[PDB]
Amino acid sequence: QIPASEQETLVRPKPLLLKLLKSVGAQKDTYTMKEVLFYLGQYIMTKRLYDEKQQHIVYCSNDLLGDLFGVPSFSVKEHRKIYTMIYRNLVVVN
Ligand SMILES: O=C(O)CN1CC[C@H]2[C@@H]1[C@H](c1cccc(Cl)c1)[C@]1(C(=O)Nc3cc(Cl)ccc31)N2CC1CC1
């Protein structure tokens, strides 16, 4: 269970995550986690990596997203795992 404050977290993406973000949004130095989740969602949706009618699984073994996250697939319901996969591709700033 994810507290609402998580979305406010300010982050500086590492180069591979920044590459992915630049294919769907404007480049800038710092993003909120709300922005990162939105942009990665749009990346997934636009590239049709998500099978909503197949156990809510994103399939990313044939995509740079798979290299970012280090998995061939994952469930969009496993929220803490998603946060952890994302965190390892950025630096939190405060
Ligand atoms: O129904 C749910 O439980 C979550 N939802 C399932 C559908 C939405 C959303 C999910 C999400 C929102 C917020 C926090 C978290 Cl951890 C995950 C999200 C999203 O909004 N951004 C994002 C980013 C990544 Cl990397 C993976 C999945 C998603 N989905 C986008 C669809 C293209 C898959």
Curated annotation (Swiss-Prot):
Annotated disulfide bonds: none
Highest taxon in the source lineage: Eukaryota
Note: MDM2 RING finger mutations that failed to ubiquitinate p53 in vitro did not target p53 for degradation when expressed in cells.
Region span, Necessary for interaction with USP2: 1-93
Disease: Seems to be amplified in certain tumors (including soft tissue sarcomas, osteosarcomas and gliomas). A higher frequency of splice variants lacking p53 binding domain sequences was found in late-stage and high-grade ovarian and bladder carcinomas. Four of the splice variants show loss of p53 binding.
Protein name (record): E3 ubiquitin-protein ligase Mdm2
Induction behaviour: By DNA damage.
Function: E3 ubiquitin-protein ligase that mediates ubiquitination of p53/TP53, leading to its degradation by the proteasome. Inhibits p53/TP53- and p73/TP73-mediated cell cycle arrest and apoptosis by binding its transcriptional activation domain. Also acts as a ubiquitin ligase E3 toward itself and ARRB1. Permits the nuclear export of p53/TP53. Promotes proteasome-dependent ubiquitin-independent degradation of retinoblastoma RB1 protein. Inhibits DAXX-mediated apoptosis by inducing its ubiquitination and degradation. Component of the TRIM28/KAP1-MDM2-p53/TP53 complex involved in stabilizing p53/TP53.
Domain remarks in the Swiss-Prot or TrEMBL record: Region I is sufficient for binding p53 and inhibiting its G1 arrest and apoptosis functions. It also binds p73 and E2F1. Region II contains most of a central acidic region required for interaction with ribosomal protein L5 and a putative C4-type zinc finger. The RING finger domain which coordinates two molecules of zinc interacts specifically with RNA whether or not zinc is present and mediates the heterooligomerization with MDM4. It is also essential for its ubiquitin ligase E3 activity toward p53 and itself.
Gene designation: MDM2
Assembly behavior: Interacts with p53/TP53, TP73/p73, RBL5 and RP11. Binds specifically to RNA. Can interact with RB1, E1A-associated protein EP300 and the E2F1 transcription factor. Forms a ternary complex with p53/TP53 and WWOX. Interacts with CDKN2AIP, RFWD3, USP7, PYHIN1, and RBBP6. Interacts with ARRB1 and ARRB2. Interacts with PSMA3. Found in a trimeric complex with MDM2, MDM4 and USP2. Interacts with USP2 (via N-terminus and C-terminus). Interacts with MDM4. Part of a complex with MDM2, DAXX, RASSF1 and USP7. Part of a complex with DAXX, MDM2 and USP7. Interacts directly with DAXX and USP7.
Family to which the UniProt record says this protein belongs: Belongs to the MDM2/MDM4 family.
